[model samples]
Target: SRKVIITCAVTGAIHTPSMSPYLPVTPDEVAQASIGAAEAGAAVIHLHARDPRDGRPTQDPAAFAEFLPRIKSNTDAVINLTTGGSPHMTVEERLRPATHYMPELASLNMGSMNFGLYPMLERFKEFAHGWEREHLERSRDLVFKNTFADIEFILKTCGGNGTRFEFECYDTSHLYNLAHFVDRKLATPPFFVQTVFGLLGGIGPHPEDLAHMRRTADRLFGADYVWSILGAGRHQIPLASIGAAQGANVRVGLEDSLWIAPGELAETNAAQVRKIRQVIEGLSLEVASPAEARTMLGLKGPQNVNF
Candidate 1:
């Protein structure tokens, strides 16, 4: 049996600062939150830097420069940069940080999909930021991710760098797209698949979806891959528990959810990690350390990455 690897994405491009008071925007905040999560057993930190001023997404190397060293100096978590920065950001902008940081793991959004966020605004009539309303409203037509061309470009540039990718499959089609990439030999196997659910345009947060993805991945890659899941919003804990029960890892943080429980907001990313750690351990699963995760995912370890 495999150990449960805890992956906590501190502050991603998706959630705004106002959504959770604990969402880390500044470099110091990101590093602190990441260190805390690492202390609580998060083996990987799926990182995406934000503008400290107003929480807008930024690709500035200077922005990433703030926390990369601090986190490295503090913890042993595998740093994984997001390839999908904001839906509107171009590949050049998205890849800028990865090029500079050379993270041990980088994200690869497996297919393109509409980023439906307007419904979230309807639920929050008193949202904080002025941009929050517009951000959600605009999701009525927001494109969530990139296409095959975009993925191929990333694979050649970042993937070729020995930066193992976290293949993010938001839809079943995305998984098939990954298989297609493998068939074409553009992406090498021992791929790390992160199955996502409950984002409107994508599949719902059904337990069966997790099982299906695992079965599909097994069918396609066999022992050549590892699996994880991130279910949006309230489904976070439950779906993650289901994933752990079925031999997959869990990704939990403000990026995928705002609530730690019903009508409650999470205070920090580490709070989320600790909660998931409890859930995984409750099921008799061992949590992987950074070194264990490096071996599990075929990472180049901390010494090799440029950052």
Candidate 2:
């Protein structure tokens, strides 16, 4: 194994409270998961805090403050917020928290596409909860995603806030869109580009696909950008290990996968990080800490953030 960055996305904008019992929703839950992930060897923790009362993703700076300080004070994990909130949020709403409390890293979706959950909706049918069925059923016609213009706005805003980003590309076309930004000189080098896989309306979960994607990115950007992979559901482990082997970064958490073992459900985000850390270490790779990551990615550093 070679040196690789491990980013633990504790909670994301997609999965809700009804999906997994382990998914972190409350501020305390987010802080606890973040600290645990750091202990498990996550260099960076991608954040998307939820309203403690209802589990809905919130953009309130106060809500973010609830956990931001805790994680910073307790652990050395790099903080990365998502400007790519849920599909329902407007770009302004998505950028509010990130712009206000500028963290070291923030996610920027490269393009607008038909990102849905109908494909995975069926898997949760056997669960005891009725909310799971309803959540998945709503994805049948939902086209919850972002557009090119929204991405540019995020880049400008985050740039002004002095924050580096994890540009999230869900498909090949999204990569092309990111290339578009790089070509235009809107985004700078030493960037952290996250290649997201396994979402509907996006590319397949084939190893060849990941190889091709990485090759294509290398062909275009070379060392100018660092790549990472986050595979939704069952694809999370295999694809992440493959990416780690490819010398790119890896991300895992309940936001993407519910089951940690073959048939065992994960109890926390730390469990996911711990599982992946073993995979990375078994390969003889080194895991980067938050400070190392800041230096590696040209981050403005935590002191630069408003928080």
Candidate 3:
């Protein structure tokens, strides 16, 4: 039977405390959320650290230090530290956690581009924290600088630590950007390409948009890559469904969407994982276990990670 890996990006740097009450901020909450999502069938748990004080995104290895052990003890889920911390942060700052922890997997962006988080302000006008407002407002002018040098630095650094990557490709150009690295032999085989969509700056949610990404990936990586889907906001399930129907892996969590259905806010990352698990099984597919994903992606074990 063909197995599909479900990756739950437990909490991302993009959404803030003002967005949802259920969004994990403190270390306890983040670890618990990851545990629940893993139990709900997520093979991989993508992580981002937040300041316990005001829910600000932080790349401080200190923050992830608090939850990494707890999640490790609680679940067998693959821990994927985020290298794309926040648009407000520099590449070195964002890469700090992964560098410190040296986990089994880490996310690496393929290109530099506008983040466009400012539009989120219009949807939710009130923020409990002032920084939340500023975070969204500042995104209008910023570009997340993931240059060729930055990508190579991350690839070489993490690769040296025996850490694999969930190579995040945001647009068509990102796919090409990743291919360039592949041609350079910078990225190794069985690499995971998480095609991101429906974000303010990435590719759109249209099926045609996904089709193009798939076509390009097929042409570029052939059978050497493990393809994954990460659809932002409301496009989460719809795009995942489309990709899964075509034999792609699925990624879901509070990091990507706040709502489970139209206007219905999700109460937990586990709930979204459960929801997507059913969505995958409804198509008669088996969700890959963490062990399976480790083998499929050629991941090293948790015992090998520093955190």
Candidate 4:
């Protein structure tokens, strides 16, 4: 691979506070983690908001407003707000922050499917917050609903603000769904397609699975889309390296996995970014800077975004 874009998702909706004490929960922590990740070779920071009181995921604009300006003030890294804010959140609820602030980018899930988190119960026995356990337990019947209509709504709503997407494809069908939008001329390139792996209900974390997803994207999108990868949990670094070797951009953060190594917890989001940077550099590849990444992803300049 030539130059790779590294996106550090400082805090995501999937992982809760109880999983690791180091997980950023407050506005100050979020800002620090994002800035640190940027300094550690992350060109982009994928973000989500927590309640602060109980660490429950929220799409409240006020919550985002707290750290967004701080992160913007400190780093030139592209700020990618989340539209897929907690599967439990309604489509309208999840669109709050993205629609309000209109950041440079937002994450868009390609399709609706069963998103299971119950498997986490085997590892996490005690939760600091009441909502954490319920959140994981309810996933047994949860379908993270990102229907065709929802996708269309997001495109129309955020596209008006010049916000591009990290189109998150969890499975083969999701790639086809994204292709459907491209076919209809509802979206344009260079599209950012983030292929997700290692989730229970979604695709598995195998070399074959990764190859199939890459091959499918290559076939459907040709050279119109920018390929990226998000390998959950222990698969994070290894899969990221594999993807980079195949010329794909990579994503890492506490949001994807809390561990920096086997049985060792990552103390900050920047540590994960630094670790991945080592892998990329070891392969004789260069990491993209924020400006380089901005140009590569076709983002509107930072000045155009609302806090």
Candidate 5:
């Protein structure tokens, strides 16, 4: 049977606290969300920290420390931290927490691009925190910079700690950028390529876009890379199902989409995880467990992490 690794992103930096009441903000909330998602059949939990005060995204080690240990105690899921923090942050700022904890997995964006969130302003009118409005509005001009030098720094710094990466390729060019790293021997084999779609600044959610990414990755890395899919907002489940039918791993949770179905907000990360798990099983694919995922991704053991 083909194994599908279901990764649940408990909370991401993109959505504001105001967007959905269910978004995990406090350390306790984040910890619970992760545990629930893992219990629901997620082999991996992708994490981000938010200020307990205002739900603003932060890469503070202390913020991460608040929940990492709790989630580790509660579940065996592989913890994958974010290196591409809020586009509002500098690369240096984004790298801080992941470098400190040195988890088994961390995400690395492949290139620099305009990460526009300003268009979200139309749907989300009121914000609880003043920074939320300013954060999205500024994205009209914000460039989420991950230059070659920045990528190298992350690869060396985190990879030295036995950490692997979820190489986030938002477009065709980003895939080429990752290939460059592979050629330079900076990124070793069994690469976990997470193809992202339906985000405002990234690739669209068309089925052709997904096929293009899959074909490009095959051409570039052959069987050396593991393909994964992340579809933003309403595209989450549909695109994940499409990817799974074609033998790609899938990611879901509040980070990727606030709704479990159209016009209905997800009540918890577990709900989204369960929905995706059902979809994978319906496709006759077995969802991987934590140990299985670690084996597939070549992850360092949980005992090896700094946390």
Candidate 6:
């Protein structure tokens, strides 16, 4: 019924290059991938940088420097950077890109949960890089350590830049954590609450799971927040369709899922954008333009970005 914001998370920290040949690793690759996704009807591009040498995730501003300018020069999409670099990255390392570049939007995962990456070992085989194997193995004991202090620091630090958050809420408690900040006057209104579903340690991907997330969010935030959904792996499209029908924006890209369809690898970020865009339009709705998203999400606009 409303214009949907299709956010393409081009090269997220989750999926390693060894997992998919199509995963963009180099600066040129990320820039081109982001540009193509924008051209395919993505209003916002949620980005993360990869070590060009090995494809490991890096929050180093210098890494982002390689691609940000190229993306800006090529497209008019809203650029959303990530503060949650990876479950393995420390908060200080994760904060680097957003603090340095100061984009219109950056992501903040609201709570620390049992972020399971070990289960990935069963699905994907072979690793070109040594860290990929260890990264997965290490997840068995991993705790993505975001504490109360970490939350306050990130909110104030990025908030000072007039940068808004695409608040990543993996479970109902994360939503409540966000509400606590709002009630305390730390986090402002018009929240871009991205309800994440289908991750191993967070919520499940059942239709009932989606309804509960909606129910709790509606009760807690009401019209003060903008709703969106990110369904990991196989659950992405079906959840995106259902969430969009019930008035939610959608997130799609290699960072979330590698497959365009079951048993078929997505060759490009643009392919997922096009697939989801088709679904949005199929619902007799439209995808929001970058300008429209800027307004809807209360973004500071592209001109305000440091790069």
Candidate 1 backbone overlaps, count: 0
What is residue 193's positional error in candidate 5, in angstroms?
0.7
* Candidate 4 structure quality by residue, lDDT tens digits, 1-307: 2689999999898888999999999999999999999999999899999988888998889999889999999999999999988888888778999999999999999999988999898999999888999999998988999999999999999998999999999999999999999999999999999999999989999999999999999999999889889999999999998999889999999999999999999999999998998988888899999899988989998888987
Flag the better candidate by lDDT, 1 or 2: 1
Cα lDDT tens digits, model 1, 80-134, are 9887878767676788878777888998888888887777765677766687677
Task: Write down the lDDT that model 1 would get.
Answer: 0.85
All candidates: CA RMSD in angstroms? 1.4, 2.1, 0.9, 0.9, 0.8, 1.0
In model 2, the worst 10-residue window by lDDT is 124-133
TM-score per model over all chains: 0.96, 0.93, 0.98, 0.98, 0.99, 0.98
Which 10 successive residues of model 5 have the least lDDT summed? 84-93
Against the reference, the lDDT scores of all candidates come to: 0.85, 0.80, 0.91, 0.92, 0.92, 0.91
Clashes per candidate (backbone, < 3 Å): 0, 1, 0, 0, 0, 0
Which residues of candidate 6, in runs, are more than 4 Å off?
A: none
Task: Spell out the clash pairs found in candidate 3.
Answer: none
User: Which 10 successive residues of model 6 have the least lDDT summed?
Assistant: 85-94
Q: What TM-score does prediction 4 earn?
A: 0.98
